[model samples]
Target chain A: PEVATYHCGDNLLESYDIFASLPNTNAAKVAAYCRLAAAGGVVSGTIQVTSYAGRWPKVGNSVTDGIKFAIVVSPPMDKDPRSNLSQWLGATVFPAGATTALFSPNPYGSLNTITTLPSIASDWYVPESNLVTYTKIHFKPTGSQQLQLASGELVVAAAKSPVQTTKYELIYLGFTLKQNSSGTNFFDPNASSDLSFLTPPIPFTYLGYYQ
Target chain B: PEVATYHCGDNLLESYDIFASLPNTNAAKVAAYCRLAAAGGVVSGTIQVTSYAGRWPKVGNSVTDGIKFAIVVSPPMDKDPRSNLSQWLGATVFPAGATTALFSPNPYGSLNTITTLPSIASDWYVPESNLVTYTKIHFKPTGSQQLQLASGELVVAAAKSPVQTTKYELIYLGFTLKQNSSGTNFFDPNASSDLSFLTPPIPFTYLGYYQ
Candidate 1:
């Protein structure tokens, strides 16, 4: 819960000979980014996870774009109070990756049940663990396409600050993806399940193009 | 745009002496991150903008945290259509930052009205511009908390692939966040107004949490 230092963004590939000359549907939309960060060596922790699987080969398409995170915690942050707040940041992206680390984190387990709550999608509320040692991934895949990732869980939480008085508002970003099994092709995270919220499980925020 | 090579990710600070050591709700939830990238010297363009405002000082609360972007363009991507598809990635942070460059882009002008559609909210629609020479930002903020960002617009689209047959699905990620006004505190983009959608504007997708 303390000592934390996670940084990832390696696998940087840009302008590779101009994708040979684009057009296999535009070179299959070449997008290969790597970033899975964490912070907390002093006290509060922060997190940043990135996702976008669909490098190319599209015409029928399956749908890709799962995690897009950003978080900052301070002023005594908690939630993984043993459980209850069940902190989160669970992610998935096959193959390989890793750069810096000193993890003393722990909280990755319950893929889903009722216990499922990764904060419903961001602004605040990230403290996930089973912590998959930070979920292996640095980025790998070329020529062919082996991209497939849908097991995600996020919770950016910061609460209070519907406006402003003192300060505290990092809200909305509670995410959950994984879908595989006749749900069509829910990005297929394999026989997935955890999705079943009759209420506000996927509350994407107001988003009206700024005002 | 023929030549594009931009990389940003320098300012990595971890466990800084343990925040002098904790306590203030616990050290104002410190968070500082910077990443504004661009790729395309060959042909296709990829963009990544990262944001989060609200370092600390909360009790009454003011509201912070904005901007989270990602995009990949290919299949000979084009929509700039002089203006039609617009083409975007306009951001702002303030103070200082720069590591790479060579932007041969152009597309900044209509700050609003009718001519505002950063693609609405994403699924297959990105190509915004005024090109602001790529919004001026690389990340800066400490103590004084000069944090205040709102002017934002995004469009990460790849379309086609409701289920999958051929391939083509980057889908949904059209963003726009810029608020600041008596709307209480629309996040204050200052006298802001780009927001005024009637129906599908703030679409946000169906979240349910992976299934």
Candidate 2:
């Protein structure tokens, strides 16, 4: 299969308005769990993914319409052994966000989950503490879709009882936006007088675990 | 025509842990925006159908199954303007997350905007200085839908504009949950569980500025 692709819009720096409320949603959060990764720390232990997974078809974008950007991580770069794998990897792209941090020199926190899988929905299955080895996922959409989340535990094991479905894809790779890297930097808000379509799109690639 | 309906599944109430990487993506901040209504208060002020003039068609809970709940407000319960609206005057349901505080209480904040002739996406509608109003609408979902919300929003207004789209089957309604009456409320972990759902959505009605 064609490996996941990564693109560099430009070397232009991008940043985001870090709201305390921005992080932690069901769709994207596992990746942002690496908060400590930016603080110069470690996932500190092993992690695992065990749950049914699903993929959201990419929402395409154009310059006039806008760019549907994402963090597409792949080879030439070493995969995170502890947990980083594209199988359980995925992303949530915002309408006008930028993708600069994904290629930055300073990588963000150690992307892995140990404990504290805060509830996504009541039915969501948080992995066992030992399963901290699973890959992490995070996402943000530009407008007011109303869901902005940080890192979360990716579902590795697929459902077999009712219908066997591959929730996490093993064919692709992942990427991480290091600390101090932001998406808003890429989009020049000053250039445009209107805030509606002024912000640029940003994307991130999450390297999933490979068994 | 008929009143438009808005429905978001567990995504509406699903809480996030930390930073989500996408723009317009769902997060505690947005969810917090939705949850602000549930905090406690009355939904006073006028909730008009301000935007989405082109029939905001309802997005079904197709992929995900959630209790389909509605946000129903009453015209005016008693002759007294401040009196509670006894029966449901209008109804707009949150997609999933049928019942939780989101359903019955329907907590959402109200922002006072400058009232632009033609509302632009960039137009600052909800502002801090604009008299803040809390709103609450009740729901039973006799058919068997859990009705509580983690968070949600309701709008009420008097005018109608194809530009901003102000008029509708029901306008001059909607409020946010600004405060919880009880010192120890469900929102606070320090509060008791029994008082969790019983907590009124918001006190916007009491604000009086919107009245």
Candidate 3:
């Protein structure tokens, strides 16, 4: 919400590098989220990004359930860090931060949550409940205009509704509102009242599918 | 915060089948966290408390990062269903649930912010800042009373944060609290407030580390 809008600026986000549970292979999704311009920021020093996956961890070895890398852009250029309107300027966090733990469809599995798994949107193990799954890529600006990005992986337990699947999809939405925007705070107890600065609600329609 | 309190009543937390990054290991830590007799609960039906060492990850052939498990405490037992706490105690989740993804440290690791890994607290990482690594484990509590019991795992991300150590220790923090207890709200507004819930906040003070 405010976090995203407040931090919207020339930001860069990186999707989690999707690695096989096996350490032999390199993570494929590591630099997947940035676009051409955002890629430039990553290459240049305009945006500083850190790696959360220090290395592929082994089983039994001490590891965090999740990991998080950051993309810091000094001098934030937005009104709200949590708003989706700044899709072009704000950073994105795919897979939503790093996590060693995955969403284990079976409590017996090792994964932590539904959104982090490498499964597709159609996998049976993908969780439908919002409680366990997060399939978005957005950035939240802090009180300071400084921008930080994050991403991760997870494995969900069973379907909360039984009809759920292991496959999960990724979808993203963003909004851009200028200063003095109109309309009530979209999500506030009241909607934003400023119409000029009012940006359309993102994901206004149902998030149809995983592209 | 009000969410950490565990009112004296029937708080039937869902069965959290402890998984392990290291499979074939004993269930000492897991058992300690889910002490049926002391915690007072029943599986009710045949629920498999399985274990694994990073098997069948949604992304790869094996889980090299780590492993975890999911526990389900259905309705009737989990009266409130809190989505705020870290551990899945029925439904209520721990306060500040968004910031900390899973419980810190690990059932198999150290417990408390002082003993976590990543060395944010170390002089090597960001010594001057004294940024120690910490973890938060939120649970969905069963709403029987204003008290929503929650459990968590905290750590420094360093083998030693309170000091330095290579010796292993019990990583996860195991306890239950109501919504109003001193340091239990998973949705606190301030980071400082969140830190207060950590008992001892130091690894040396943690019982699991000493023993």
Candidate 4:
């Protein structure tokens, strides 16, 4: 599918803190998903990085540039599986966020949707679901030209399937693309060594579900 | 100290569900306190039910008449112990509300406060502390006339103290008192059998802390 992008400059994102800026309820829901991912529960899906074209957060000497996307989950985590799988996902995953970053498994019927919201990937909402859980996705630039990109989609696979692998598709709405040297989004899937017991989705694998 | 109360009828409360009505963040915070209380941690404070003069939630055969009060925890539970104690209190307690009532134990610095808010015990805030934890408190009227009260403080102690025994004091503010036949707030502190691993302050021994 044709990927959409949203471009945001460092100026707009300088004050953006994914966890701090998120609304209380939404933040908790996203944290729940993270918990589930950490537990190897429902959040077991792949997030194909659709696009990564923007400047990254500043770091050491060189400005640490990378792609920042939004990880949006469905059925809002606030919604229901309408049954056991749903209850378990909310019960187990939601609490974990309270501990670290509220997150949860993708539950049996949940769906994992991806899109690159330009600049700051904050305030990402899906009309189809009530309990949507979203997070800021980052990946450091690899190789040389780390600051900007030439315009293209970056596909990152999850450690496992988020829902039914066939459910992998984008709704293609609410995207703002911008022109800039494509930047690298920093990621560390293997950084769980120091992470808490309840972890959010790492790398390209994220979770989402719908009503 | 002079006792104050908040008067609310069962009719008005018929649609009010403590767990559902609370703001998302407050709900999560209350849940975290419950988790700590269940773990037999610092949330082990005594909630002195200052006053309870309201009709209880209806039950099957007879309308359940009991002393209802608000559980307030303070220092707001946001200070020092700046640890998972706060997080767990939110994560664990919030979800439990779905099946039953909402609750939690006190974090390290948070103090447990209680009072009778007019009508429903919601919208509770404490200026003295930054980490205040407030919840609805309930107790089945034990003695003969368990429906109303004649204006007196109904003190209910927690199974344990959230902080030290010396921290007990009164901060007069936000209380609603209504007239009713004197009532008894029945309690069963020994009942922890079927409770979830994460529990909230029971009876009147809610949570409170100050800066």
Q: Model 1, A6-124: lDDT tens per residue?
A: 32222333321111111121221121222222221111222222222333222332433422222232111222222211122222222223212122111111011011223322222
lDDT of each: 0.23, 0.21, 0.21, 0.23
- Tens digits of lDDT, candidate 4, B1-211: 0111111111111222222111212221112111112111212221211111122222221223222233433222223222112121322222223211112223342334333222223333322222233333221111123323222122322212233223232222112222243323222233222211111111133333312
Judged by DockQ cut-offs, the docking class of candidate 1 is incorrect
Report the C-alpha lDDT of model 1 over B93-176, residue by residue, as the tens digit. Answer: 212232121221211211221122233322222233422112221111111113233234444333322222222122223334
Worst 10 residues of 4 chain B by lDDT: B1-10
Interface RMSD of 4: 21.1
Best to worst by DockQ, what's the order?
1, 3, 2, 4
- CA error at residue A16 for candidate 1, angstroms: 42
lDDT of 3 by residue, A1-211 (tens): 0011112232233433322122222221122122211110011011112222233232321112212211212111132222111123344332344110121122211123212333332221222222232212123211111111122222112222222232322222111111112212222222222211111111111111100
Give the per-residue lDDT of model 2 (tens digit) for A186-206.
Answer: 123232222221111111123
lDDT of 2 by residue, B73-171 (tens): 322222222211112222333343322222222111111111112222112223211211112243221110122323333332221123332211112
Superposed Cα deviation of residue B211, candidate 4 (Å): 25
Q: Write the per-residue lDDT of candidate 4 for residues A65-141, one digit (tens) a residue.
A: 22223343322233322211112122233322332211322222122212222223234332211212222223332
CA-only RMSD, every prediction: 20.9, 21.6, 22.4, 20.2
Q: What is the lDDT of residue B74 in candidate 3?
A: 18
Candidate number that wins on DockQ, 1 or 4: 1
